[PDB]
Design a protein around this nucleic acid. Structure first.
Ligand SMILES: Nc1nc2c(ncn2[C@H]2C[C@H](O)[C@@H](COP(=O)(O)OP(=O)(O)OP(=O)(O)O)O2)c(=O)[nH]1
Ligand SMILES: [Mg+2]
Ligand SMILES: [Mg+2]
Length: 539
DNA sequence: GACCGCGGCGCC
DNA sequence: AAACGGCGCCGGGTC
């Protein structure tokens, strides 16, 4: 492969090496390109970046993110990963893709640029006459790679000094719980060690072991088990509280302050485009799609995510999203009618569950209600439901009968999808995104029924993922015309940063864009809110 | 020091 | 734990 001097011509494929996996933190150790049987190895990578019209290759977005960090508007174009991920969503890493489709993922920039060339050719051949996947690539994923590059580069502002103060109060409160716990135990032990805790609960005290752990068969100390033991002993309550506080302290309060980038003074997630089986995104390195909200301390954490001074945050969340999508995919007249009447299923279940007026339903209850409703739908057992509702197997049985009885045509939709998946080996979204579910023909029932549950979930969760992705592609250009930013996506939610002056305008627009993104047999309602912080914005 | 599998748990 | 699904990150060992 011919070594040509550096500058590549128009349309050349890129290859690059990083010091570490995160583009906002990485040093650019090497940069190369390749077109028409040639390799160009940049002598100084950072300068060499100025020459490029676009990032075109494996992980184009990562290089575009790093380019944006350096003031360069190098947008991402073609990426063989995005092609492979639509061909098969188990195609998730370049190591795997390379091997599957005719190369080897190396550590040298040149070799990676040549890999990008030959992998694109092969994969692009695999997609000719795959009309719906080509549609998805050009009209959703490829433009989206650019939108995410801008989100990553921008980041979100975080109240550092606030969280540092919060850390010290939690540490005091944690210390009280461990000191209580040890006193009831009658001796000190590492309370973060679940093995030690097992012995204390089940051997040293006479507590009944509810469940075992999957891989190694140890007696489980899961919150579920511990809730079932709330009355057995006082120490349980303390353990549950200790578990909440240390989880949040070790995962959010302490790491996040130390992850502020020095140039930006902001927090930059990575939005992994080829990471899930359904077509959802994932967020990592810091994961900002799992920031706390539920518990009071979780909320105090969430409010640490704030706007730039002079700006406001704008949070938009699709209402009852996967239920609405389901009603379209199934055509359940009875279920459509619920959304045509503007009724909230999460509130109805909540009001019913706790036995209260709908106006009394709080967020805590509503969250519990979602578990009930999605759980049933996707195949939760009567056994579990009973404990989730905390009511008899007699009565919890009757719920899966009545819930399903209201809305037929779904089960008809479930059966159909599974039969199609048996026949063709995959299932698909409304836009023809595929997931191969080969264990539908599995001879072992537990493995078969697991596969089935994954199978009929995907079209629903994945269609919703496609809608949110599409809405993002359409919305992003309109935001930059308004001098507003797109900050985060949390599956069916978007978080925007708009200047106070234009904040309400952005909110109105972005709602209409999201609701009208692709009309269906049901109206896609969106809840929007505005605030100085993330918590206030959703309230 | 890097990485591993596990149990556990935050969010959607 | 439990026959909901989809994620990524945290705190007893190997090498
Ligand atoms: N299978 C399953 N899916 C969930 C669960 N929680 C959330 N999801 C999926 C389905 C939801 O529609 C979607 C978005 O989560 P949200 O918190 O926005 O819930 P949803 O939109 O249904 O209700 P909302 O009206 O927005 O509060 O993610 C769950 O516990 N199980
Ligand atoms: Mg929602
Ligand atoms: Mg949501």
């Amino acid at each position: 492969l011919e070594e040509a001097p550096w500058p590549p011509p128009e349309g050349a494929f890129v290859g690059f090496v990083l010091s570490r996996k995160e583009p906002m933190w990485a040093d650019l150790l090497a940069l190369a390109a390749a077109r028409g049987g040639r390799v160009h190895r940049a002598p100084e990578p950072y300068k060499a970046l100025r020459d490029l019209k676009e990032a075109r290759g494996l992980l184009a977005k990562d290089l575009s993110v790093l380019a944006l960090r350096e003031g360069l508007g190098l947008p991402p174009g073609d990426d063989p990963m995005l092609l492979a991920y639509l061909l098969d969503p188990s195609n998730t890493t370049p190591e795997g893709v390379a091997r599957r489709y005719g190369g080897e993922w190396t550590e040298e920039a040149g070799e990676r640029a040549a890999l990008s060339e030959r992998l694109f050719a092969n994969l692009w051949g695999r997609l000719e006459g795959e009309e719906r996947l080509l549609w998805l690539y050009r009209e959703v994923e490829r433009p989206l790679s650019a939108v995410l590059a801008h989100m990553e580069a921008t980041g979100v502002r975080l109240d550092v000094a606030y969280l540092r103060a919060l850390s010290l109060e939690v540490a005091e409160e944690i210390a009280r719980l461990e000191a209580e716990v040890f006193r009831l135990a009658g001796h000190p032990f590492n309370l973060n060690s679940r093995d030690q805790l097992e012995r204390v609960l089940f051997d040293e005290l006479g507590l009944p072991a509810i469940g075992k752990t999957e891989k190694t068969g140890k007696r489980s100390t899961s919150a579920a088990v511990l809730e079932a033991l709330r009355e057995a002993h006082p120490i349980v309550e303390k353990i549950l509280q200790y578990r909440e506080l240390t989880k949040l302290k070790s995962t959010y309060i302490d790491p996040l302050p130390d992850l502020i980038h020095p140039r930006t003074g902001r927090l930059h997630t990575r939005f992994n485009q080829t990471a899930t089986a359904t077509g959802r995104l994932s967020s990592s390195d810091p994961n900002l799609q799992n920031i706390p909200v539920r518990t009071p301390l979780g909320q105090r954490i969430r409010r640490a995510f704030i706007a730039e001074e002079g700006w406001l945050l704008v949070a938009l969340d699709y209402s009852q999203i996967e239920l609405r999508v389901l009603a379209h995919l199934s055509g359940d007249e009875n279920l459509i009618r619920v959304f045509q009447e503007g009724r909230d299923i999460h509130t109805e279940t909540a009001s019913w569950m706790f036995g209260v007026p709908r106006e009394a339903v709080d967020p805590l209850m509503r969250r519990a209600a979602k578990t009930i409703n999605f759980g049933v739908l996707y195949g939760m057992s009567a056994h579990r439901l009973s404990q989730e509702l905390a009511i008899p197997y007699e009565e919890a049985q009757a719920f899966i009968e009545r819930y399903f009885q209201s809305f037929p045509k779904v089960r008809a939709w479930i059966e159909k999808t599974l039969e199609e998946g048996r026949r063709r080996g995959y299932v698909e979204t409304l836009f023809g995104r595929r997931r191969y579910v080969p264990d539908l023909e599995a001879r072992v029932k537990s493995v078969r029924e697991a596969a089935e549950r994954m199978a009929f979930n995907m079209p629903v969760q994945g269609t919703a993922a496609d809608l949110m992705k599409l809405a993002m592609v359409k919305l992003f250009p309109r935001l930059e015309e308004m001098g507003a930013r797109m900050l985060l996506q949390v599956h069916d939610e978007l978080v925007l940063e708009a200047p106070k002056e234009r904040a309400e305008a952005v909110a109105r627009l972005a709602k209409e864009v999201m609701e009208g993104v692709y009309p269906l047999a049901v109206p896609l309602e969106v809840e929007v809110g505005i605030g100085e912080d993330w918590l206030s914005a959703k309230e």
